Amino acid sequence: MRFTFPLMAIVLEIAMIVLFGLFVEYIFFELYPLFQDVHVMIFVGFGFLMTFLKKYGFSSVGINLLVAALGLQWGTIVQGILQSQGQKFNIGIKNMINADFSAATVLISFGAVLGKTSPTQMLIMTILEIVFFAHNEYLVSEIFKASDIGASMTIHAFGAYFGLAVAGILYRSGLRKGHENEESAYYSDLFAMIGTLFLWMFWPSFNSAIAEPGDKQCRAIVNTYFSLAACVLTAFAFSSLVEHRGKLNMVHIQNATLAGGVAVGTCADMAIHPFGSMIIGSIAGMVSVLGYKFLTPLFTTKLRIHDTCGVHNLHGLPGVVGGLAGIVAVAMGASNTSMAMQAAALGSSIGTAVVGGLMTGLILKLPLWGQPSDQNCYDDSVYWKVPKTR
Amino acid sequence: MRFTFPLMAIVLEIAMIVLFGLFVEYFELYPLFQDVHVMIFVGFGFLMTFLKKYGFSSVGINLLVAALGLQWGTIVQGILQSQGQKFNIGIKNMINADFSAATVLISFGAVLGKTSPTQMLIMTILEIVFFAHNEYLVSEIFKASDIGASMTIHAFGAYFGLAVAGILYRSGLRKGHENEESAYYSDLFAMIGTLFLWMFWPSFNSAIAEPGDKQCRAIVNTYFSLAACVLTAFAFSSLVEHRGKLNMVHIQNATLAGGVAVGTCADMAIHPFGSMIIGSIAGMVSVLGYKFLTPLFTTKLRIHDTCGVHNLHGLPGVVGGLAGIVAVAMGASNTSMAMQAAALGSSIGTAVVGGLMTGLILKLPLWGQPSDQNCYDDSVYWKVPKTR
Amino acid sequence: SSKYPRSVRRCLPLWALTLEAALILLFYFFTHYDQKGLVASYQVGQDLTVMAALGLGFLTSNFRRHSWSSVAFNLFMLALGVQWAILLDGFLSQKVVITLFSIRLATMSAMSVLISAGAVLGKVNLAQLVVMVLVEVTALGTLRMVISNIFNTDYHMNLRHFYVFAAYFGLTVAWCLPKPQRATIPSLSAMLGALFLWMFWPSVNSPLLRSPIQRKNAMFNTYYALAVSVVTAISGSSLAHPQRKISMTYVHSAVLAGGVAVGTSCHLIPSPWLAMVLGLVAGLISIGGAKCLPVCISVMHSIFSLLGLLGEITYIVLLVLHGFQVLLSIGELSLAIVIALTSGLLTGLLLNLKIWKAPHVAKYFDDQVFWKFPHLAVGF
Ligand SMILES: CC(C)CCC[C@@H](C)[C@H]1CC[C@H]2[C@@H]3CC=C4C[C@@H](O)CC[C@]4(C)[C@H]3CC[C@]12C
Ligand SMILES: CC(C)CCC[C@@H](C)[C@H]1CC[C@H]2[C@@H]3CC=C4C[C@@H](O)CC[C@]4(C)[C@H]3CC[C@]12C
């Protein structure tokens, strides 16, 4: 009622400690730089990407930190228990990387409901979404045996669709026309560019960390690098195209510049060529800007799904472009493994995300977690001590 | 026309895709690459965010210019190395593409606030050609050592940008502009780029250094040059201001001059004390340039340098080339002194000629250049928020 | 007394340039240069550099009108401290060979001073900070030399006590200064610094570990303890607040609680659950300190001193499992605390000197004392 959030967090930490004590024991320095880049993407990249809101920077970065810090522990436990089939396991650098990937999926879902949820709801969403995400990625990697090294399907599409499903269940009628606080400021947009640029720079490590050392890891780095480079050009061009008087919009420049990194993930270690990554990146940037311009108003006003950060345009549509690219790549001989297995990976990702998101959102709707009122959405002052001076 | 910029960006990206499909084929140096990458996108981009009403354009056009530049630099540098044949992409190709982006960002600092993104696209395309040809001339014809690229990146980029800015001279801006001012939080943001550049410069100067003694020397020499440069930049910033006040321009930029001035000599055995001497001189020269030489360039030579890149990249780059000549004279390296001097002269001359031609192309009233009243304002090209 | 600052146009440049000339001379007379894993060894020192400049530099930038001085003065102090620590650690451990490892050690020495300085920033000028840097580097080197002479330890391995030394030195210097706030954008910048400190703190828990296995275990332990401490800090910040809200300033410091708690024993901890227990204890102790220490000047520095003491205490408790060892370790800890307090008192006494032209107490925490701004009347 007043002590709900500290109580739930301490209970969760005690549970994490018990699970580590029962199940967790102790290439590493080859992959540690890549893990560090992934870590910076998790905590600075997504953390400051969402600080564009003028009255929500504290909650954006701080709840990002809280969600991701709980998520790395819980994802370690869940992914390791899945890999070990219920027995004790030793953790190495790959366990940490995969746990940060799980936290990334939860943060993508967080970007959909940003400014409309409490930290308690975010703890609950972290715990449930890591379970759904980890079971889906186990199904994709071990049952389907598909190729998703950058996880366009198991991270980006899954997280974006799980978030939209929570956002639709948690939909508020008062917010459909808009909100006075759902607005950026100048220095808020500069902080959001901090997050954008760190994500953009370290994405090759994100897509290549789990790739096989040698040709596949190098291909993943090169493909991500050039896909992002092409994505920037198309995102700027179409942001000028769609907006009034041809003026750039910082929402597009902050988000659609990462669509090429999202859309190359499934094909990253595949031999698609530098030109192929650049074509995907160029399309992903165009699709992301067009989504922000046209799909987000349609989704908000007509479908009653409100996406605060437009994660559907950064992670959802570019994630489906990535899965679609991988099926086409298998068709063209870029990679082995079945075309149908890649298609099944895409379908399982999207479907399990929408099922799990709806059930998690049903748990979140309960009026027991201190969610803000319609008037107090996108406002740090509900949960934070806010300085008088900006 | 409002469709000039999106058409140019799309056509340039399609040309990049075709060139990559025609000329390009497919882990110890990857962390150094990532340090250089951070210097390109966070360092320079936020370093230029000091202008109070131009932060969006500084950081965003930095991203756009560098993203175009790495692709075009990949093509141009790979073609020059391969003599027209297909080439493979390794970590060194990516590092060199980031370097080519750095040169254009340095030139962008000179014309910041007075140009449109379309102009920046054109400048990136032409400048990378001029830069890569000078770089090939220095590395292959002269065979002079410039491992930190004091001459080929910093002096080249600075004098190219000064040539462009001199071509694009606006008479109404000579006595100052209302928008050409910093803000308190804007300088706080600019310190982010300052700190990232300062922290990662030893990787910038050592990434392509020969592994072993040369790479270790480049790391250590760059580090101690920067350490000396910070102290001298602070001291001279206090010295040249009333009552010893620190100037944020000096602290944001002149603290980096040690990295620029040690670049030619970074892998030479100049010792930590020698690198410290070079960094101290660089800090002094940079602060003095910002205090006295920039007003002379703006008001008398009609060369308006927005970011004072002549004081961070130009003069310390020349100091670095001269230090390379002296170090060869002292026998620290085994190159030719005449070749180091030739490299410095060719860098400056090619930079000025190419900047002249590029600015003449940019001077055409086709690219949506702002008016004098609208210089240093994001609102010409961006949707600006109502609040700060 | 005039509240308007005295001109430093001759004091500060002369002081800094004389220091740099002396450093260049000493390096010339006493320093000397000198494979498969050069980049791997460089990465650890680069992480420490990032934590020193970005982390501690921005962490204290939270002040409404003192963010410029926090960031830039931290950079100046790092540049002075590393150069002086190279020479001092060469002298007290013997010419000085300059390797990547000695640069990494000197960065740790400078980070000691940067942590201590957060207790006094906003109340001192740059010359006072120069004096603080010089005296604190010399004092930490003396402490390490004395520990190596008495307890037969290694001078470079005595750099483990740097948490507790920095905490107590900073508090003792703050206590000697004359007696004397947030904004949103500086708070977000301080969050950036806090995040970089939090992310790279596993590196500072294992730059002194030679063996690969101890490094890997130390990094794991620091990682898991830090994650637990972050969750505990953000959750329990609401408990220790009259307004029942989360305090961003409290989070900025309490994120690092688990890393401080395990830092001295992260190689000894064999299983991640024990590191997570230590991180939970560190977070709860941070909450209790934030709720009690103000009642009985810097609250964050005081709770850091408590956390450093707890880290030493848990190192003592763990060291027995893996009676004379207890007494030697307690004597070493008491020696570190006594030397830190004594050199802090001496530093604060030297800082009160009128020759430094310190800011007036009515002018604390304002960049206007040190920096040029437009449209101001200057001088008389
Ligand atoms: C790069 C620097 C150091 C040396 C080279 C400077 C050259 C490239 C530039 C800088 C000064 C420039 C001149 C400065 C001012 C004017 C007056 C204007 O009505 C026409 C252009 C003209 C005449 C410029 C032509 C180009 C110019 C000569
Ligand atoms: C503008 C330019 C000319 C100024 C910079 C040049 C001078 C001041 C610098 C750069 C080149 C330097 C020298 C280069 C190499 C060595 C060899 C080394 O074993 C002793 C130091 C010594 C001799 C350096 C001392 C300082 C030095 C002479």
Distance from CA of A73 to the nearest CA of B (A): 26
- Please name which of C364, C263, C248, C345 lies closest in space to residue C308, comparing C-alpha atoms: C263
Q: Which chains touch B (3 or more CB pairs under 8 A)?
A: A, C
**CA A48, A51, A57 angle in degrees (round to 5)?**
115
Rounded Cα distance between C58 and B191, Å, is 10
Give me the residues paired with residue B246 across strands. Answer: C371
Instruction: Considering only the beta carbons, identify the residue of A5, A44, A387 that sits closest to C184.
Output: A387
Distance B163 CA to ligand 1 centre (A): 7
Distance B326 CA to ligand 2 centre (A): 6
Residue A197 with chain B: CB contacts under 8 Å: 41-42, 45, 59, 63
Output the ligand 1 site: residues, CB below 6 A: B 159, 162-163, 166-167, 169, 301-303, 352, 356
| Amino acid residing at B351 | A
Burial of C321 (0-12, 13-18, 19+ CB in 10 A): exposed
Give me the residues paired with residue C97 across strands. Answer: C32
Q: Where are the alpha helices (DSSP H) in chain C?
A: 11-30, 38-50, 56-59, 67-92, 100-117, 126-151, 162-176, 184-205, 212-236, 248-254, 257-262, 272-292, 299-321, 324-351
Q: Return the HEC string of chain A.
A: CCCHHHHHHHHHHHHHHHHHHHHEECCHHHHHHHHHHHHHHHHHHHHHHHHHECCCHHHHHHHHHHHHHHHHHHHHHHHHHHHHCCCCEECCHHHHHHHHHHHHHHHHHHHHCCCCCCHHHHHHHHHHHHHHHHHHHHHHHHHHCCCCCCCHHHHHHHHHHHHHHHHHHCCCHHHCCCCCCCCECHHHHHHHHHHHHHHHHHHHHHHHCCCCCCHHHHHHHHHHHHHHHHHHHHHHHHHHHHCHHHCECHHHHHHHHHHHHHHCCCCCCCCCCHHHHHHHHHHHHHHHHHHHHHHHHHHHHCCCCCCCCCHHHHHHHHHHHHHHHHHHHHHCCCCCCCHHHHHHHHHHHHHHHHHHHHHHHHHHHCCCCCCCCCCCCCCHHHCECCCCEC
Residue to substitute in B220, B260, B265, B278 for testing ligand 2 pocket (most ligand atoms within 8 angstroms of CB): B278
Half-sphere exposure of C232 (CA within 13 A, CB side): 29
Q: Does residue A86 come out as left (phi exceeding 0), alpha (psi in the -120 to 50 range) or beta?
A: left
Contact (CB, 8 A) for B255 and C75: yes
Instruction: Considering only the beta carbons, identify the residue of C43, C100, C378 that sits closest to B243.
Output: C378
Contact (CB, 8 A) for A247 and A305: no
Count of CB atoms within 10 A of residue A180's CB?
11
Rounded Cα distance between C316 and A266, Å, is 50
Contact (CB, 8 A) for A291 and A312: yes
Return the percent helix, strand and coil in chain B, to nearest 5.
70, 0, 25
- What are the extents of the domains in chain C? 10-369
CB atoms B71 and A183 under 8 Å:
no
Is residue C97 within a helix (H) or strand (E), and if so which, with residue range?
Answer: strand C96-98
Is residue C31 within a helix (H) or strand (E), and if so which, with residue range?
Answer: strand C31-33
Contact (CB, 8 A) for B245 and C370: yes
DSSP secondary structure of B295-323: HHHHHTS----SS-HIIIIIHHHHHHHHH
**What token pair was written down for B80?**
């020059």
The gap from C-alpha A377 to its chain's centroid, in whole angstroms, comes to 22
- Return the ligand number nearest the Cα of C32: 2
Residue to substitute in B156, B297, B303 for testing ligand 1 pocket (most ligand atoms within 8 angstroms of CB): B303
Contact (CB, 8 A) for B60 and A247: no
> Superfamily assignment of C10-369 in CATH?
Ammonium transporter AmtB like domains (1.10.3430.10)
Contact (CB, 8 A) for C173 and A375: no
Burial of A336 (0-12, 13-18, 19+ CB in 10 A): exposed
| Amino acid residing at B15 | A
The gap from C-alpha A239 to its chain's centroid, in whole angstroms, comes to 22
Burial of C291 (0-12, 13-18, 19+ CB in 10 A): middle
Q: Which chains touch C (3 or more CB pairs under 8 A)?
A: A, B
- Please name which of B202, B209, B220, B236 lies closest in space to residue B273, comparing C-alpha atoms: B220
**Would you say the CB of residue B101 lies under 6 angstroms from ligand 2?**
no
Contact (CB, 8 A) for A307 and A164: yes
Q: Does residue A115 come out as left (phi exceeding 0), alpha (psi in the -120 to 50 range) or beta?
A: left
Rounded Cα distance between B31 and B18, Å, is 30
Residue C32 with chain B: CB contacts under 8 Å: 271
Position of tokens 């597009």? A252
Count of CB atoms within 10 A of residue C378's CB?
12
DSSP letter, residue B143:
-
Contact map slice: A 24-63 vs C, CB within 8 A: 24-26, 28-29, 33, 36, 39-40, 43-44, 47-48, 51, 57-58, 61-62
Final resolution, Å: 2.4
**Any idea of the CA torsion for B321, B327, B328, B329, to the nearest 10 degrees?**
110
**What token pair was written down for B35?**
């340090």
- Going by CA atoms, what residue is nearest to atom 13 of ligand 1? B166
Position of tokens 């602060």? B287
Handedness of CA C87, C92, C96, C99 (dihedral sign): negative
Rounded Cα distance between B20 and A289, Å, is 24
Burial of A297 (0-12, 13-18, 19+ CB in 10 A): exposed
Count of CB atoms within 10 A of residue A367's CB?
6
Rounded Cα distance between B114 and B375, Å, is 5
- Please name which of A59, A85, A76, A80 lies closest in space to residue A5, comparing C-alpha atoms: A59
Instruction: Considering only the beta carbons, identify the residue of B10, B13, B26 that sits closest to A219.
Output: B26
Count of CB atoms within 10 A of residue C338's CB?
12
Rounded Cα distance between B297 and B295, Å, is 5
Domains of chain B: 3-374 (1.10.3430.10)
DSSP letter, residue B292:
I
Contact (CB, 8 A) for C260 and C163: yes
Distance B162 CA to ligand 1 centre (A): 9
**What token pair was written down for B71?**
């692709």
**Would you say the CB of residue B19 lies under 6 angstroms from ligand 2?**
no
